[model samples]
Target: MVSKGEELFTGVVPILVELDGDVNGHKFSVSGEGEGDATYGKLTLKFICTTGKLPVPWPTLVTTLVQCFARYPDHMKQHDFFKSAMPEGYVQERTIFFKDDGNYKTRAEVKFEGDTLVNRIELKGIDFKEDGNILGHKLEYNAISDNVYITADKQKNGIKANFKIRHNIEDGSVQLADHYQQNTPIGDGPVLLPDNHYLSTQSALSKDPNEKRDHMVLLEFVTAAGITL
Candidate 1:
């Protein structure tokens, strides 16, 4: 039998992300491989700014994008696989959406099909034009490559913007001004951030110290796994 570690190690994971309109027009991609059970695992991801211009002070955009992936485990546990893997009372259906949060309107939906899990989020702004004003993100995961795709097409006044992002496990490289492959460093060490709100349900159920601190653990694992921008 193949160990979980072995399976994850051999897997190729890709995530595609895109943003348009206010944030700047760009397509971001991440790819990596790792292993773990429903409750825990490790992965290494490399990111690339494939096309279009990034916002000024590019690091800020990079930081926010990383934070999104860092929250994967927290997002994954909301699905059925992890629910079945955890002990009773460990997984509960708590809505992850925020209704009418002033600046933007946000909601999320999750569905499962056999081994695949799909999660979709829709966002709208209070001031956005009624037509051609919608932002969306969709994440789908399986045993092979857990992919996340993003799209935004919001227009205001006379301006219109559209953005998209894509990911892959086989070809783990990015196209910046030139093409930069994985393992090519652009200076600066990995940035580690705290996971203050991660795994709230699991953290409450177990007394294990690791469970409480598992959020950064994945980040650490991925950082150690390989390349960064």
Candidate 2:
């Protein structure tokens, strides 16, 4: 006898994001609307700008992108088998890989000091499967730009996206994930955002927290049935 949904959606989709960053105490929020099918989802939005300035050489900008790619549990690069096929020096510190599945994960760390831009991106993939069953996977990426854009190869047959952002020095390490969006085959609409774009340190400090917050980028998709992917 064969099981159902076992062969269900096992592919992921492309992700696109747009946001504005400012060096002079300026913050912003992304806003847009798009609709499409499972193969292709349409997205059109913009970010709401605010007044807040983070340090010129902000590492969070890069780390935030890394966290975005980490959202997909199976898309981690460390889970892939073709590890040697990746870029050189792609497996350095400030990086994580998925060893449970034959997939890959990576992250890019970037900072800006006036006109000069410093950046580094890492990638990793490992094998941790017994019978071709993926057990664990991790992936990440980050970059600083006036606006951020992303697109992933079709996996789990869906689409994903990430938006750009800016922060102020007084904000004390602003969590970019706080202002992200998500959708699925269950619904067809614009990218979703958090109720309140604030990272709760209590969850990290609590010994028995009901929910664990993970760094992620905004990714939304739709299905052929005119539903969220």
Candidate 3:
């Protein structure tokens, strides 16, 4: 007898991440090769600005994005993924990869500094099976950082995203959407959603929006190193 599924998603590692370092003018190499997924708070939405600016639960600015629905669990990235040195000396970075067939063209972000970059490379590839698995949906969480300096006072900073988020799948569907108050399809097609227009379902909190937070999702598709749908 044979089991049934999209089948294309079998035997794939769901979530995997890497950690590296750079101090002063010296650079550190890839370290957390075997690093597993880290944890974060379960806030519905977070504010991505400099520390102490936004009133969101995050204390030192947030840099994470989230995905979810009914069939799987939410996998959020730690908030410190973008935490950098206040005066320079020690800097760290984290890069996460996945195995995808194709489709790596799109990204998104917001800052309450209008900083902390968000790049969506959902289509990258890896030879290994990762860790984060969103049950049937098979989702992953990612965050990374980098910097460029022109001089002592002209240094620049960069980021990807942070998450105190929950990529939950409440009902066993691949829609990957949750409603503390929201909104799918199948081989017929995927579900269409807002670009994370509202911060939260409450509709009473700060309604900061971002072009990056919006993306598409579906089930039974070939896994990639991938989505902004």
Candidate 4:
């Protein structure tokens, strides 16, 4: 006897569903198969990342940041502080981030089929460092829609307090001035961070052969997660 779901699955299937909205400054539309009758059973999900042509490789940038922290144990310790206090893992099965709002926001998409699943994820922006300063402020008025301001502090008199603006990559202009302090993570902003496991793997993959910590840390996490690969 076929269950209702199974019977429905045997018939014509709904091919597509569309979701439209703004995601991390990117206008995105997601289309996928409609649910049909199927027996409740094991499900598998897989995901991948794709990108358009760019000046720098996205994975390389992430790997570079991971390596920087790997070398500066103090930085890792600082990151660990946030990781321990907040949930430093996947946001959705397809996306990953920490629970803290001030620092990071990462999101992704998932797709599934009768026999397979996939996640298409991308990295957006990252948090600003205390020393980081915005460039090209005078031209901000040219593109107010995308340009804005953020400063590290209120003391404009101090060089550190001077504002920094987020550049509108799409428009090639200054978007806004960003005024925020270091460690004050952005709760739900348009940026992408990696899952702890993914960060670990990428770090190890990019490390020098002679770097012991790089390899060891990754092995430790992999074992802890029961990931055999």
Candidate 5:
């Protein structure tokens, strides 16, 4: 069955649906199919990040944070001392505490910039130790090349960490690295973090590479969405 907004809710058939465009200032779209007499509907779901400052790759960071909590729900709840600070419902600003050691604490604050979400981290009462555009310092996406590049600059205790991620065009493989330096009399020389891989072969063909990446990232944040055939 088809409906307004170009949305198709099909049942028990190999149905293909593609939707796009905006409705009342919100963008919505969909693609793919369902079966077994399923009654499908169009609903927009938004997941908010309540942990560390949004990372260079917002989805990656959010996904990882979700996984961390999912893996240790009890522990997370035990340390979630800032939940009382979170406002109810859809909010643009939220401060959450993820760790607390008698004397030191780690918390994150997230807010919005028009359509963009920005984040900042605090450690032991010191703020802005790590802060930047969660999306990236500079972002570039090439559809033809299927390549994405994100550059970010984060600092902690007077040390600056320059981060970068590159996604391969053909295989959807990701590589991440960080170059940093500490500023202090006893600080060591400049440091280059080892390259990290953020790609997986599983579910490689299930959907768009980018969408797959998002799914993989979200798996760790939301466990119920991960269990499947």
Candidate 6:
């Protein structure tokens, strides 16, 4: 025995579980450049980019090269990359990256009473309040925005590489670069390339808005070895 609003509005007695929390679409990027410097020899550098603020109108997440891998063989710590002397107008948020190493998360208090079904399904920033009729009319809120990089578990994009390698045959040095090549839709990490080889890699990995492919993960490898092969 229930009221008309209870039956028409919510068919069943909803489970009231009010949960409030903030979720940040994980933000991070890793890029690297390697060269065969006669003085420094083989150099493969890795850098990380992170997101600081979200844009309005359409929630387009933007990032920048913030910190670079500190020293060799240490993927734990990081050093600032965008210190002073920044470009024209840069958002100096100072987002120290290489996180996920520390606890990242929060909470608060609230007050409510009986008929607690509303609290149970209170999706923050989400609105499902009906204002038309018992059937279905319009949505009180819109969720057509991307949660940072919302490419959770979709189909894996395939990327192929068949570029020429500029090898300095004088000694045994090769200059490999990924400048303006492509960026992973998400935190693609570093594109670990195969050492001393240039072949079309059918990498299990894209460019545009229904036009270009979305670059996800990159594989890079650079190692110094014996004489040229």
Candidate with best lDDT: 2
The lDDT, on a scale of 0 to 1, for candidate 5 is 0.22
Best-to-worst TM-score order: 1, 4, 5, 2, 3, 6
lDDT of 3 by residue, 20-122 (tens): 2221222222111111111211123332221212111211012222222011112211111111121111122223222221111112211111211222211
Order by lDDT, highest first: 2, 4, 1, 5, 3, 6
**Superposed model 5: Cα runs more than 4 Å off:** 1-72, 81-84, 88-168, 171-173, 177-220, 223-229
Give a tens-digit lDDT track for model 4, residues 77-191: 2222122212111122112221221122323332233532322333443333322221111221121111111122223211011123243333453333333222222233222
Model 5 scores a TM of 0.20
lDDT over C-alpha atoms for residue 163 of model 4: 23
After aligning candidate 3 to the native by TM-score, how far in Å is the CA of 30 from where it should be?
30
lDDT of 6 by residue, 7-124 (tens): 2112222121222222233232322222211111122222222232211111011111111111112221111111111111011111211111111121111112242222111111
TM-score of each: 0.24, 0.18, 0.18, 0.22, 0.20, 0.13
User: Which regions of candidate 1 fall more than 4 Å away from where they truly are?
Assistant: 1-14, 24-40, 56-59, 62-197, 200-229
**Model 2: residues >4 Å from true position, as ranges?**
1-71, 75-149, 152-162, 169-229
Give candidate 5's total backbone clashes: 4
CA RMSD of all predictions: 19.7, 20.9, 22.1, 18.8, 19.0, 25.4
**Segments of candidate 3 deviating more than 4 angstroms:** 1-94, 97-122, 127-154, 157-161, 170-229
Model 6: residue 1 alpha-carbon error in angstroms: 91
| Model 2 lDDT, residue 19, Cα | 31
Superposition TM-score, candidate 3 onto the true structure: 0.18
What TM-score does candidate 4 reach?
0.22
Q: What is the Å distance of residue 68 in model 4 from its true position?
A: 26
**Model 3 residue 221 distance off true place after TM-score fit, in angstroms:** 27
